[PDB]
Amino acid sequence: GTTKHSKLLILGSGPAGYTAAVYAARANLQPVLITGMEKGGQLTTTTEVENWPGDPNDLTGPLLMERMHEHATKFETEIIFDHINKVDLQNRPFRLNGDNGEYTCDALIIATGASARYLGLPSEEAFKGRGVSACATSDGFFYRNQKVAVIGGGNTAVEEALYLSNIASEVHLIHRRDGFRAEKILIKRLMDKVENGNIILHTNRTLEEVTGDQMGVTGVRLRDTQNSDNIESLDVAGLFVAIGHSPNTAIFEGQLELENGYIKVQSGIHGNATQTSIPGVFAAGDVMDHIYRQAITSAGTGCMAALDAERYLDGL
């Protein structure tokens, strides 16, 4: 087994990992980046992106990530295709174990993301990128003045429904239970939009099937109530499955301070804002952000992490 030492190691090949790589390479730090299993991150699972600033037309998630990969390799970032399964952050240098070897480093940037879960239905899988989506902030504007459905019961779903009711003609919130398990302020605003507006509630329903045509989604079939099998049918142009994200942080449990699985950073306006609870370990992207979750905020913290890492490595 091999053991490669690097001054700076970056975990993840999403927008945060690639931006941290171009900033680290241009700081002459010679970064090594480990891609993980999903080479290019969550953006490779989507079709059109029209909120990456400065790219008004013709951008897709795959094309953005190919450009970011080109950018990192232009400045000679060593890119390694591997995935980390064990970590030891309590001894110096930090040791990380992959499938293809052992890695040690003096500074670490963690940009392992927070992947969206789906329902697992074949009909849902069929319409991904053509009507079924997992990000309302990104894709909500394509369904402006149209009917939309959101499925879920926690915080994300009530937030997605609330955000979407300002864009769509109406929002259909679908949930298995007869009650939402979201924050008190979210549920208050939800019930105001149910009563005086835009959101139609469909509690005690489960999604059976996503129907549609050649261009995409046209409807949704629901079933059940509290004791019965009624089977509803909704005419809808888009579906937003909002059942939660999975921050890829299991490997860091007991090593780093986490908050609902998200890596806690120092934050603040006085620098060293991406530093985790361990000196020399920094986090960027969706793994440390459960509020905004965009490629542009992930690239922004990717940049901050590389400059924090540079300042750490130089004794400041």
Ligand X SMILES: Cc1cc2nc3c(=O)[nH]c(=O)nc-3n(C[C@H](O)[C@H](O)[C@H](O)COP(=O)(O)OP(=O)(O)OC[C@H]3O[C@@H](n4cnc5c(N)ncnc54)[C@H](O)[C@@H]3O)c2cc1C
Ligand Y SMILES: NC(=O)c1ccc[n+]([C@@H]2O[C@H](COP(=O)([O-])OP(=O)(O)OC[C@H]3O[C@@H](n4cnc5c(N)ncnc54)[C@H](OP(=O)(O)O)[C@@H]3O)[C@@H](O)[C@H]2O)c1
CB-count exposure of residue 80 (10 Å: 0-12, 13-18, 19+): middle
Shortest distance, position 311 Cβ to a second copy, whole Å = 8
Give me the amino acid identity at 299: A
Give me the amino acid identity at 57: N
Residue 294 binds ligand X, judged by CB under 6 A? yes
Binding test (CB under 8 A) with a second copy, winner from 4, 45, 48, 71: 71
Contact 152, 244 (CB under 8 A): yes
Binding test (CB under 6 A) with ligand X, winner from 6, 42, 77, 274: 42
Per DSSP, 221 falls in state: E
Residues at the contact surface with ligand Y, assessed by CB under 6 A: 119, 151-157, 159, 175-177, 181, 206, 243-245, 260, 290
Shortest distance, position 299 Cβ to ligand X, whole Å = 8
Query: Which among 286, 250, 249, 282 is positioned nearest to 267, based on CA atoms?
Result: 282
Residue 116 CB neighbour total at 10 angstroms: 19
Per DSSP, 166 falls in state: T
Residue 191 binds a second copy, judged by CB under 8 A? no
| Binding partner of residue 49 among ligand X, ligand Y, a second copy, none, CB cut-off 5 to 8 Å per kind | ligand X
> Looking at 11-19, 159-167, 252-260, 269-277, which segment touches ligand X (CB under 6 A)?
11-19
Shortest distance, position 279 Cβ to ligand X, whole Å = 21
Residue whose tokens read 């979210």? 186
Cα gap 251→200, rounded to integer Å: 40
Binding test (CB under 6 A) with ligand X, winner from 77, 138, 165, 272: 138
Residue 96 binds a second copy, judged by CB under 8 A? no
Binding test (CB under 8 A) with a second copy, winner from 8, 10, 64, 132: 64
Q: Which helix (H) or strand (E) holds 222?
A: strand 217-223
> Looking at 101-109, 111-119, 187-195, 236-244, which segment touches ligand X (CB under 6 A)?
111-119
- Token pair, residue 213, equals 């045509």
Residue 55 CB neighbour total at 10 angstroms: 13
The CA-based diameter of the chain, rounded to the nearest angstrom, is 67
Query: Which among 102, 92, 115, 117 is positioned nearest to 34, based on CA atoms?
Result: 102
Query: Which stretches of the chain bind a second copy, using CB under 8 A?
Result: 15, 18-19, 22-23, 26-29, 50-57, 64, 67-68, 70-71, 74-75, 137, 140-141, 144, 162-163, 166-167, 185-186, 189, 259, 262, 264-265, 267-271, 273, 288-292, 294, 296-297, 299-304, 307, 310, 314-316
Query: Which stretches of the chain bind ligand X, using CB under 6 A?
Result: 11-17, 34-38, 41-43, 45-46, 49, 51, 83-84, 111-113, 116, 133-135, 138, 248, 251, 285-287, 293-296, 298
